[PDB]
């Protein structure tokens, strides 16, 4: 079968600087009419994929001139001449030589580099409504930070927790290139009522030292 290989799998780029992504086909995509049947698509966060380049080098309608495609035969390159924050997303090549049979490359994640931004941190106790049903979720929010790397530690009466929390992180924002993160500590009602002080301690490059938010049950 025709195989489509993209490289790199991911890259991070400072706005204003160029990005290059390549696609290699196991078989030539050039047909006798001189045209290369290779397209590029982008999928931005929360959106369906959209066409960027068709037939190797032709910008699709509405696509700005920062995007260009080149190559022939079995090797193709997408270049973004000057990256902007709104370019964050996944980029896919696709062969159409076998039309109406198509094959997508595995995709390349484009991340945007920006200046360090400290998270704003918030802690939320469990609601009275949840506690009845025998469960207590404690939520720690880290809002609008960069870089992605962040450490969240839970402490209950100053005892370090392990094994009872889960994190979720947003996709990088298309305007300000930051992340937000939630950490949720799940305890039984009985365990939650055994202790008084609940704290989440956040370590991040943008903080001058780890920040602790806490509440007394």
């Amino acid at each position: 079968d025709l195989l489509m290989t993209q490289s790199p799998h991911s890259l991070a780029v400072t706005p204003g600087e160029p990005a290059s992504i390549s696609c290699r086909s196991s078989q030539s995509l050039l047909l006798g009419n001189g045209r290369n049947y290779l397209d590029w698509y982008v999928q931005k966060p929360g959106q369906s994929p959209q066409l960027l380049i068709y037939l190797g080098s032709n910008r699709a309608s509405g696509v700005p001139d920062r995007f260009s495609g080149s190559g022939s035969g079995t090797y193709f390159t997408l270049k973004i001449s000057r990256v902007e924050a709104e370019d964050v997303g996944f980029y896919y090549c696709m062969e159409a030589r076998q039309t109406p049979r198509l094959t997508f490359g595995g995709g390349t994640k484009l991340e945007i580099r920006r200046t360090v931004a400290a998270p704003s941190v918030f802690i939320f106790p469990p609601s009275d409504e949840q506690l009845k049903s025998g469960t207590a979720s404690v939520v720690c929010l880290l809002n609008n930070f960069y870089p992605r790397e962040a450490k969240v530690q839970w402490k209950v009466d100053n005892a370090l927790q392990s094994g009872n929390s889960q994190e979720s992180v947003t996709e990088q924002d298309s305007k300000d290139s930051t992340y937000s993160l939630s950490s949720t500590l799940t305890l039984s009602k009985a365990d939650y009522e055994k202790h008084k002080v609940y704290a989440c301690e956040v370590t991040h490059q943008g903080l001058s030292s780890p920040v602790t938010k806490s509440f007394n049950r």
């Binding site: 369906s48 159409a96 109406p100 929010l141």
Partner: protein
């Protein structure tokens, strides 16, 4: 301008069957090749099947004999009948408009028009609607509040704030699978701390797979 709308994605037992529909509006897609493309976990695109204007079909080996594409020009629609489904078939399925059938050697413009997708979940787990709890703003600038949407299956859940009027500062987090096999997520918003006394904040949760619509007031405790 053509718009495509897929429907029919739902939770189905392993071994079961499901029919997806794609309805085109705006213009006829009767002369176009139409494609089905699927995506697991919001990453990766896999072409699955296509149908031409004349009803000719094409499939990847992994679905050949189990999937059947068909179309109805009078309803300006395309269909994907799936049988003997497996967990490897779970994902979001997009309908995509291709070139005019038989013309790609002369006129090929890429795959211009995609639907929003419909979600297929192959699992023996039960549908379960979420519980919605407030994340109340702290009594102690910028304030955060939110809603915790806990213990539901399958995906997806949508969250809006104040019936869509409030969009600035909203983060709805990707769902996380708990060890139980149920999903949970939070939606948070940051608002002027001075508005906490005068502005009402309501999170509008919709879990269509379970017919759950819940409005939760979130106020200072």
């Amino acid at each position: 301008e053509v718009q495509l709308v897929e429907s029919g994605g739902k939770l189905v037992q392993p071994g079961g069957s499901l029919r997806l529909s794609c309805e085109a509006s705006g213009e006829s897609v009767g002369d176009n090749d139409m494609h089905w493309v699927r995506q697991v976990a919001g990453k990766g695109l896999e072409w699955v099947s296509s149908i031409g204007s004349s009803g000719d079909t094409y499939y990847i080996d992994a679905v050949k004999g189990r999937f059947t594409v068909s179309r109805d020009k009078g309803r300006n629609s395309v269909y994907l009948q799936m049988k003997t489904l497996t967990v490897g078939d779970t994902g979001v399925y997009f309908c995509v408009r291709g070139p005019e059938s038989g013309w790609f050697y002369h006129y090929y413009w890429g795959l211009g028009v995609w639907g929003r997708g419909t979600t297929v979940t192959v699992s023996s787990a039960s549908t379960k609607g979420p519980s919605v709890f407030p994340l109340a703003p702290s009594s102690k600038g910028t304030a955060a509040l939110g809603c915790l949407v806990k213990d539901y299956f399958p995906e997806p859940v949508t969250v809006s704030w104040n019936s869509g009027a409030l969009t600035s500062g909203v983060h709805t987090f990707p769902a996380v699978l708990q060890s139980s096999g149920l999903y949970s997520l939070s939606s948070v918003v940051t608002v002027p701390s001075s508005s906490l006394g005068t502005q009402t904040y309501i999170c509008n949760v919709n879990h269509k797979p379970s017919n759950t619509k819940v409005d939760k007031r979130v106020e200072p405790k």
